[PDB]
Enzyme design. Structure first.
Site, PDB file in Angstrom:
ATOM      1  N   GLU B 350       0.739  -1.106   0.065  1.00  0.00           N
ATOM      2  CA  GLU B 350      -0.309  -0.138   0.009  1.00  0.00           C
ATOM      3  C   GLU B 350       0.609   0.967   0.021  1.00  0.00           C
ATOM      4  O   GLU B 350       0.414   2.620  -0.591  1.00  0.00           O
ATOM      5  CB  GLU B 350      -0.819  -0.272   1.133  1.00  0.00           C
ATOM      6  CG  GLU B 350      -1.650  -1.522   1.507  1.00  0.00           C
ATOM      7  CD  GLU B 350      -1.966  -1.779   0.318  1.00  0.00           C
ATOM      8  OE1 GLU B 350      -2.307  -1.456  -1.117  1.00  0.00           O
ATOM      9  OE2 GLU B 350      -3.391  -2.750   0.236  1.00  0.00           O
ATOM     10  N   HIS B 480     -15.977 -12.204 -10.338  1.00  0.00           N
ATOM     11  CA  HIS B 480     -15.942 -11.184 -11.423  1.00  0.00           C
ATOM     12  C   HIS B 480     -16.889 -11.478 -12.638  1.00  0.00           C
ATOM     13  O   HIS B 480     -17.250 -10.517 -13.243  1.00  0.00           O
ATOM     14  CB  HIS B 480     -14.425 -11.510 -11.932  1.00  0.00           C
ATOM     15  CG  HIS B 480     -13.471 -10.454 -11.102  1.00  0.00           C
ATOM     16  ND1 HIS B 480     -13.120 -11.922  -9.934  1.00  0.00           N
ATOM     17  CD2 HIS B 480     -12.578 -10.136 -10.825  1.00  0.00           C
ATOM     18  CE1 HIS B 480     -12.288 -10.899  -9.220  1.00  0.00           C
ATOM     19  NE2 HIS B 480     -11.856  -9.614 -10.012  1.00  0.00           N
TER      20      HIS B 480
HETATM   21 ZN   LIG Z   1      -2.670  -3.907  -4.985  1.00  0.00          ZN
END
Ligand SMILES: [Zn+2]
Ligand SMILES: *[C@@H]1O[C@H](CO)[C@@H](O)[C@H](O)[C@H]1NC(C)=O
Ligand SMILES: *[C@@H]1O[C@H](CO)[C@@H](O)[C@H](O)[C@H]1NC(C)=O
Ligand SMILES: *[C@@H]1O[C@H](CO)[C@@H](O)[C@H](O)[C@H]1NC(C)=O
Ligand SMILES: *[C@@H]1O[C@H](CO)[C@@H](O)[C@H](O)[C@H]1NC(C)=O
Ligand SMILES: *[C@@H]1O[C@H](CO)[C@@H](O)[C@H](O)[C@H]1NC(C)=O
Ligand SMILES: *[C@@H]1O[C@H](CO)[C@@H](O)[C@H](O)[C@H]1NC(C)=O
Lengths: 197, 588
Positions: B350, B480
């Site tokens: 992150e 998905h």
């Molecule tokens: Zn990522």
């Protein structure tokens, strides 16, 4: 100059130490709020939205520029939108020119009778300012000082430093511009209360 | 005046107040996420609705300018992004029907019971830890029958409406519309075509076929020890024995298949606990890493605005790891940090995402994105690859100062990483190829399941345990597929990641294996990376790829170079066992 609480403090064409005691005909002061990113735009020879449509600086500047952060002053939760800025203008701005025109700026060839729409935009835009904004996005309070010099008698001068006083010892002296050397001592004759020398 | 000047003025107007509405919506979303309550949902919905209405009105206004007149190649790009009329071409009734179909799909997938035994509550744990053939088969077949059988006609209607909508937008199919992302035009020597993406993936899969064949042979050989009477030496792996409901990843298979089980893996959780890290020193070490690389500091408001630990009992908050780019110079990270190595690596990931976000902040609003959909996760992930090395942990004080590593641990780590990296590429390729053929119309509606399972047998080497008729819709069970998400990004991501890793490691003058390499304390590699990072979406992704790797198109040779000792060890191990699978054999 010794406050050290200002992010930017620059004097253009003049040394801060030497101007601390100098005489000028007049001095001009200006205050406005810009984004921290737009701080660099306030300089001679610069170009930008602020420089072209909001405030123009002559290249031969003879003053100083002071800048500091104002996030704690005019940045609130939800955005402080009490400050506007010209984003659209027909042309540029002359140095030291104030424009407050609110006519709907027209982009295309077709005129609009004061109605927003296609190829028609409002010249002024609002500023958003919050404490969570970026460092360059935070609001900044900037003061610029300009010095005027003409043939008229000067009015503003630096604080002259006054030395001590000694007597009964032949020393150099200077009183109000009157120079010379000698021995200082009291007398008895009294001047009228408007005379020197 | 000229159309170019009017377009420039219009874009200058839009970017302002586009940033404002985006910041307002992002702040509302963050307020809802960090503090969940009834009141915040209304604010979030209002902000989203306002932003959507403004975007639609601005696209409608931007429809006026003809694109041919503009000759700037940046104003043209911004206009091309803005004049995305898209789904509004559909009629009001058709749009309502499509939205209802999507909402019904999302609702039916979200709430699915095979009883009581929901997908995340139960089912997942059964498919990952049952170790029993009958239980896993029952769970697989029950979930299939409950979900895919009911998602058949909704999926058919979705296909027909989406295909017609895509054809309405001057596109051949919906798959072509998805492939429109990997397309750059107007630049000599750097152009790309949507018909080039149908190729250039088969080539890499043919290149990487032998390694997957060796890995599949080794996994089957090590798996026949368990389930003694249900696996054949020559044949395909039964579908429900891949350690997952869909078999997307083979990570759960690691416990069964270890080369050297005597040697423990590297784990520093106890080292972290002994030194009593305070869940903020992890982000401090991440910032130290990115500074030592050569990238700039973190913003002052990052450390105070962002929340990096569970708020507590009184305040509830969802804290899935997320990097926030709210705009206006605002960066945040949403994480429930704990003292674990996984938290360390995801904090690095992150933090890399945030560093990528900081790079292109000077670009206009429309060009504040990666070059394509695969350029971002790879950049975030290569940071974790660099930080996972034993050399970096030894440089930090958490690992033992005198650590001696044997090649058994190297083989263990390489196999553990491969079971997730190279175990999912054929599945992605097969799923995306099947969806592309379905949208293109090559597969008739009466041959969906037969072609799906034929591809599963041929390309992946996975065979179904029990036959499925045409009423079943197995692919719709995946998250998905039913929820309208693209899938080639995961295929391109690993290739881009390994290309970037090889380029940065060769720029850092490293010698030896690629899996022991580290890019810390290397300023030139950081500068080379930042040269590409600062571009954003302004330039074609081919030039961005060239600016680091040096090659215009993606190449998979670095991926094989990474897994070369593992390939040699597998070849040595599989010199006696059969390599390859036979399609004819079936469990029934
Ligand atoms: Zn990522
Ligand atoms: C979260 O929202 C509630 C709304 O009832 C509020 O009372 C509370 O102070 C909020 N928590 C914060 C701002 O940390
Ligand atoms: C496109 O316009 C921008 C300003 O909006 C300018 O900086 C750029 O040079 C232009 N592109 C070309 C190729 O001149
Ligand atoms: C948006 O709708 C108009 C309707 O006149 C159409 O001409 C245009 O092509 C559409 N935009 C697309 C398909 O990108
Ligand atoms: C910026 O990074 C340097 C590099 O070590 C560091 O010394 C300095 O403290 C950092 N400053 C801030 C404000 O993070
Ligand atoms: C990077 O440099 C720091 C600076 O002292 C040093 O402590 C660390 O061991 C170095 N790490 C590597 C991998 O070179
Ligand atoms: C690698 O590991 C194996 C494990 O049995 C060992 O026999 C061998 O000596 C190690 N080194 C090399 C170079 O193969």
């Amino acid at each position: 100059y010794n406050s050290a609480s200002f992010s930017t403090f620059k004097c253009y064409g003049v040394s801060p130490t030497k101007l601390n005691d100098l005489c000028f005909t007049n001095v001009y002061a200006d205050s406005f709020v810009i984004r921290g990113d737009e701080v660099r735009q306030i300089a001679p020879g610069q170009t930008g939205k602020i420089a072209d449509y909001n405030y123009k600086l002559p290249d031969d500047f003879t003053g100083c520029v002071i800048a500091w952060n104002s996030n704690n002053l005019d940045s609130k939760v939800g955005g402080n939108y009490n400050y506007l800025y010209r984003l659209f203008r027909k042309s540029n701005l002359k140095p030291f020119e104030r424009d407050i025109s609110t006519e709907i700026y027209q982009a295309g060839s077709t005129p609009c009778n004061g109605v927003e729409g296609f190829n028609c935009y409002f010249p002024l835009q609002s500023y958003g300012f919050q404490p969570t904004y970026g460092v360059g996005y935070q609001p900044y309070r900037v003061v610029v000082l300009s010095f005027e010099l003409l043939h008229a008698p000067a009015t503003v001068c630096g604080p002259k430093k006054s030395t001590n006083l000694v007597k009964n010892k032949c020393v150099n002296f200077n009183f109000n511009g009157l120079t010379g050397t000698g021995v200082l001592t009291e007398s008895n004759k009294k001047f009228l209360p408007f005379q020197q020398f | 005046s000229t159309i170019e000047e009017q377009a420039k003025t219009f874009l200058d107007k839009f970017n302002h107040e586009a940033e404002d509405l985006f910041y307002q919506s992002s702040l509302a979303s963050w307020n809802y996420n960090t503090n969940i309550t009834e009141e915040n949902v209304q604010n979030m919905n209002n902000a989203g609705d306002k932003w959507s209405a403004f975007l639609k009105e601005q696209s409608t206004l931007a429809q006026m300018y003809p694109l041919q007149e503009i000759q700037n190649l940046t104003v043209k790009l911004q206009l091309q992004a803005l004049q995305q009329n898209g789904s509004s071409v559909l009629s009001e009734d058709k749009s309502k029907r499509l939205n209802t179909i999507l909402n019904t799909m999302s609702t039916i997938y979200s709430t699915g019971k095979v009883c009581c035994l929901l997908l995340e509550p139960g089912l997942n744990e059964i498919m990952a830890n049952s170790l029993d053939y009958n239980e896993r088969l029952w769970a697989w077949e029950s979930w299939r029958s409950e979900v895919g059988k009911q998602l058949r006609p909704l999926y058919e209607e979705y296909v027909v409406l989406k295909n017609e909508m895509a054809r309405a937008n001057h596109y051949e199919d919906y798959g072509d519309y998805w492939r429109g992302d990997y397309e750059v035009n107007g630049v000599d020597g750097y152009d790309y075509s949507r018909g080039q993406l149908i190729e250039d993936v088969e080539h890499t899969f043919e290149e990487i076929k032998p390694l997957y064949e060796h890995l599949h042979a080794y996994v089957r050989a090590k798996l026949m020890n368990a389930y003694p009477s249900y696996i054949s030496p020559i044949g395909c792996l039964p579908a429900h024995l891949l350690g997952d409901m869909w078999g997307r990843f083979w990570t759960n298979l690691y416990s069964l298949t270890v080369p050297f089980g005597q040697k423990p893996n590297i784990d520093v959780t106890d080292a972290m606990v002994d030194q009593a890290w305070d869940a903020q020193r992890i982000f401090k070490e991440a910032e130290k890493f990115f500074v030592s690389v050569g990238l700039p500091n973190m913003t002052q408001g990052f450390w105070e605005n962002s929340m990096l630990t569970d708020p507590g009992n009184v305040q509830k908050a969802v804290c899935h790891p997320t990097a926030w780019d709210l705009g206006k110079g605002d960066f945040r990270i949403l994480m429930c940090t704990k003292v674990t190595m996984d938290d360390f690596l995801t904090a690095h990931h992150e933090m890399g995402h945030i560093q990528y976000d900081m790079a292109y902040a000077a670009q206009p609003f429309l060009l504040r994105n990666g070059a394509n959909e695969g350029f971002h996760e790879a950049v975030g992930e290569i940071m974790s690859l660099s930080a996972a090395t034993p050399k970096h942990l030894k440089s930090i004080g958490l690992l033992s100062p005198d650590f001696q590593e044997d090649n058994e641990t190297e083989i263990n780590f390489l196999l553990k990483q491969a079971l997730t990296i190279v175990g999912t590429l054929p599945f992605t390729y097969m799923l995306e190829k099947w969806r592309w053929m379905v949208f293109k119309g090559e597969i008739p509606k009466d041959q969906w399941m037969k072609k799906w399972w034929e591809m599963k047998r041929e390309i992946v080497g996975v065979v179904e345990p029990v036959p499925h008729d045409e009423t079943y819709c197995d692919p719709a069970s995946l998250f998905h597929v039913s929820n309208d998400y693209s899938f080639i990004r995961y295929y391109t991501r690993t290739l881009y990641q390994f290309q970037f890793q090889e380029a940065l490691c060769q720029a850092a003058k490293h010698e030896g294996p690629l899996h022991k390499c580290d890019i810390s304390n290397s300023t030139e590699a950081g500068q080379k990376l930042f040269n590409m990072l600062r571009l954003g979406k302004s330039e074609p992704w081919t030039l961005a790829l060239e600016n680091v790797v040096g090659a215009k198109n993606m190449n998979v040779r670095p991926l094989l170079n990474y897994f070369e000792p593992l390939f040699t060890w597998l070849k040595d191990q599989n010199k006696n066992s059969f390599v390859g699978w036979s399609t004819d054999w079936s469990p029934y």
